[PDB]
Design a binder for these strands. Structure first.
Ligand code: MG
Lengths: 49, 224, 79, 224, 104, 217
RNA sequence: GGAGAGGUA
């Protein structure tokens, strides 16, 4: 069902797309994985240490 | 909101105390940044004591770990509401479902070693859009002990310091509400009975948002 | 600047008395009014002493004999 | 051989209000990517923009309080204001004034616009007044800048609130190289720059700005 | 271990990634402490005994202790391989740098 | 404001005649890569140059043979010939001649060169003769080009090397000036083939790009 | 200064 939902949108079903480096501007081979992840900022700051 | 939850959010959100869950469904009569008023439906109303439900929202107040908790309305004029529904979102909630952090676009790939062992490389949009900054609230106290050589006071005058550092103290000796102090400043000016003035801890910035003073009985109360 | 001490250790093959000889030289150089034998390039005294040791124009025995000679002249400096 | 065709601007297609496309043609082999990448980095890096810097609300002392009548806090007002889009013709530092009374949203269109300052999106929302006799009057300060400038690192009364600046018109830049058809030749490219600005910058002006900055900074290599 | 300091406009001690193996120091929140040697003999001792370029072989056994750990190794392994049929197979080159230019 | 730091080329160091290290300091936050990378591509890919393209061995019909008198094979010979560095000021395409007899190394310095044709490194060994009475004469055809090409895309054919550069690289790191914070620094390092001094090559690349993007401004 | 609780590696 993840594959089906992905294909509902026009995204590549494999889950991995092809990026481009920022500095050089040339392509990464080996298509990489990109998505959306939920992240939290834990209560261990640097300025309290 | 978290893009991929486990459906067990709303329960944790409303079964904790932070969100302001309605008690009798009705119609919002006037919302505001601080309070809410609900005209109760006809059915859920007692015969006498008609009244209308009213909620007050706790604005910025320190938690136990110095993280500010406040509540924001999540409704508007004319919106019906039902029993058990959510009205005011607390800290880290969104339309009454738990939301602790942010969802961000992630790509798995080594990048010039800047994520060697477990480190994380963070683009500058994450800080430009200001979507991780967290508000902290600290409480600083200053007491006027009753010691030998007589007691000591909080007079605005202290020795051997230029008026520049005193620009932020009013005539009494307590900083104004809203002054933008920085590292190494004077919040209340105390005197060595014979300079014990409280000072901001080094390195911290921020704005003063509230001042309180308690006085023991039998002592005249100064202007502030 | 220095990153290693390998060649200096080769000149003085113990890696412990190396520390003491270099320290004595740097002490002569810092509080004492002596001068370096190698051109300085905005380098601190410890690194300069190590560089001097590296070229082999100062070791323990030559340091001691120079100290003896200068002290003999100092004894002859009062007349 | 030993001679290179020079590029040119063929058409600036305006697909939408804030979405644009620029076409450059012709390009010898191996320049497509070079110019595309150089221009992308320049455009995303440094374009002169305009943004709000200081706010001065009438009856507020610091941003952590609340005002009676408005729905959001002051923090959300500042946040919504930070994303305001505006262009100024001559002056490098202007002051706008907003006055509103009566129920409803307060769009950017309620700003008392001067002759030269131009708002690009007159439907942008700022706050919701929820009382027939609750009013807000504020004095916005707009400056001209060249990037990101946090409130902390810049450089008076207790009435000024400082927001972070985000002077950058462009938001997303993409590009594509594709073979074209000159009278007759093979391996002759054509560059297409897709631009999504926030509406405050004219495309052709932006691309010319990037070209001139790149060239006049590259001048330090000739006659070194 | 000793080190030279390089001033950084931040608030975290930057550490060279090769010595993490020696410290057994993951970067998932580990804290480290900094001391300064005051006297002269202490400075020379640091430089000539504990400067990181003098502890390469572990005292337990001669084995090196700055082995490239976990990511550089992956890079090198992916670098020295051979697909049976890749782009530009079979030509001849005039030395390493020529191959580098060809690849870039 | 809205005005950028122009640096003045800080250092150029000639470790050798054909290997140079030029460091430029300082540059905006994130232009070291932009400039260091455009120059990289414009140097490697496209630039005027003259390198041998075709081979004509007197006694070889085809490139699948071996000659009585040479201790190597033909393909290694043309490999060693690929690195030959020649400059021709006047004309673009030329055909040049060599002819060697007798046991001994066959160096480019012994070639029959003209005024316009100049060999950069005359000590460029080409082959070794193992017979006192075996001789080889050879005709080499050289052109003007723009980087590398294969030969099947165009007689004994070899690949081309139309460029004076051989290696380019760079790095970025922060550095200090009068009183100022948080910029970047560029360190170009190049190794030309002697056909032109490295500094001249950098000048050529910069002017190529600058005149390329003129019509925009 | 000493106890108790929680937390990080
Ligand atoms: Mg750890």
């Amino acid at each position: 069902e993840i594959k089906e939902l992905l294909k509902l949108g026009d995204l590549p079903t494999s889950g991995q797309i092809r990026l481009y480096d920022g500095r050089t501007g040339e392509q990464f081979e080996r298509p990489v994985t990109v998505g959306y992840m939920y992240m939290l900022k834990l209560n261990h700051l640097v300025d309290d240490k | 909101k978290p893009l991929v939850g486990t459906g067990m959010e709303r329960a944790v959100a409303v079964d904790s105390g932070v969100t302001a869950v309605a008690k009798r469904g009705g119609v919002v009569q006037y919302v505001d940044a601080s309070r809410i008023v609900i005209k109760v439906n006809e059915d859920e109303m007692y015969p006498g004591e008609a009244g209308i439900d009213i909620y007050n929202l706790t604005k910025y107040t320190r938690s136990n770990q110095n993280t500010c908790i406040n509540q924001m309305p999540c409704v508007s004029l004319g919106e019906p509401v039902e029993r058990g529904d959510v009205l005011a979102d607390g800290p880290s909630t969104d339309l009454g479902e738990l939301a602790l952090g942010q969802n961000m676009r992630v790509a798995f790939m080594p990048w010039n070693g800047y994520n060697f062992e477990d480190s994380i490389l963070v683009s500058e949009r994450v800080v430009q859009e200001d979507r991780f900054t967290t508000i902290h609230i600290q409480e600083l106290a200053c007491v006027s002990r009753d010691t030998k050589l007589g007691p000591e006071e909080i007079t605005a005058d202290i020795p051997n310091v230029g008026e520049a550092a005193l620009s932020k103290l009013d005539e009494s000796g307590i900083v104004y509400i809203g002054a933008e102090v920085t590292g190494g400043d004077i919040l209340v000016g105390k005197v060595t009975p014979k300079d014990s003035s409280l000072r901001v801890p080094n390195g911290v910035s921020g704005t003063v948002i509230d001042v309180q003073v308690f006085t023991r009985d039998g002592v005249e109360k100064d202007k502030r | 600047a220095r990153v290693t001490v390998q060649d200096a250790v080769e000149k003085i093959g113990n890696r412990f008395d190396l520390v003491l000889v270099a320290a004595r030289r740097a002490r002569q150089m810092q509080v004492g009014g002596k001068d370096p034998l190698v051109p300085e390039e905005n380098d601190k005294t410890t690194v300069i002493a190590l560089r001097e040791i590296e070229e082999g124009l100062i070791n323990n025995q030559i340091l001691d004999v120079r100290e003896r000679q200068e002290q003999q002249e100092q004894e002859a400096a009062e007349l | 051989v030993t001679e290179f065709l020079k590029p040119r601007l063929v058409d600036i297609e305006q697909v939408s209000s804030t979405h644009a496309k620029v076409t450059l043609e012709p390009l010898e082999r191996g320049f497509g990517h070079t110019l595309g990448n150089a221009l992308r980095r320049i455009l995303l890096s440094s374009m002169p923009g305009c943004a709000v810097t200081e706010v001065e609300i009438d009856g507020v002392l610091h941003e952590y309080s609340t005002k009676e009548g408005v729905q959001e806090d002051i923090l959300e007002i500042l946040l919504n204001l930070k994303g305001l889009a505006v262009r100024v013709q001559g002056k490098d530092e202007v002051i706008l004034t907003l006055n509103k009374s009566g129920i409803g949203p307060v769009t950017a269109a309620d700003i008392t616009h001067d002759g030269d300052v131009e708002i690009v999106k007159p439907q942008h929302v700022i706050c919701h007044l929820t009382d027939e006799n609750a009013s807000i009057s504020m004095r916005i300060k707009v400056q001209r800048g060249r990037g990101y400038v946090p409130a902390s690192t810049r450089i008076r009364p207790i009435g000024r609130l400082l927001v972070d600046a985000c002077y950058s018109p462009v938001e997303r830049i993409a590009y594509n190289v594709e073979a074209a058809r000159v009278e007759q030749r093979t391996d002759l490219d054509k560059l297409v720059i897709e631009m999504e600005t926030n509406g405050t910058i004219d495309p052709e002006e932006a691309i010319r700005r990037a070209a001139t900055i790149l060239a006049e900074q590259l001048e330090a290599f000739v006659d070194l | 271990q000793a080190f030279e300091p390089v001033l950084i406009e931040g608030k975290a001690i930057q550490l060279h990634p090769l010595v993490c193996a020696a410290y057994n120091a993951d970067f998932d929140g580990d804290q480290m402490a900094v001391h300064v040697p005051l006297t002269l003999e202490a400075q020379l001792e640091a430089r000539a005994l504990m400067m990181s370029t003098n502890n390469i072989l572990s005292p337990a056994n001669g084995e090196p202790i700055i082995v490239p750990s976990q990511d550089v190794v992956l890079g090198l392994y992916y670098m020295t391989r051979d697909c049976v049929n890749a782009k530009g197979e079979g030509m001849v080159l005039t030395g390493p740098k020529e191959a580098e230019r060809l690849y870039r």
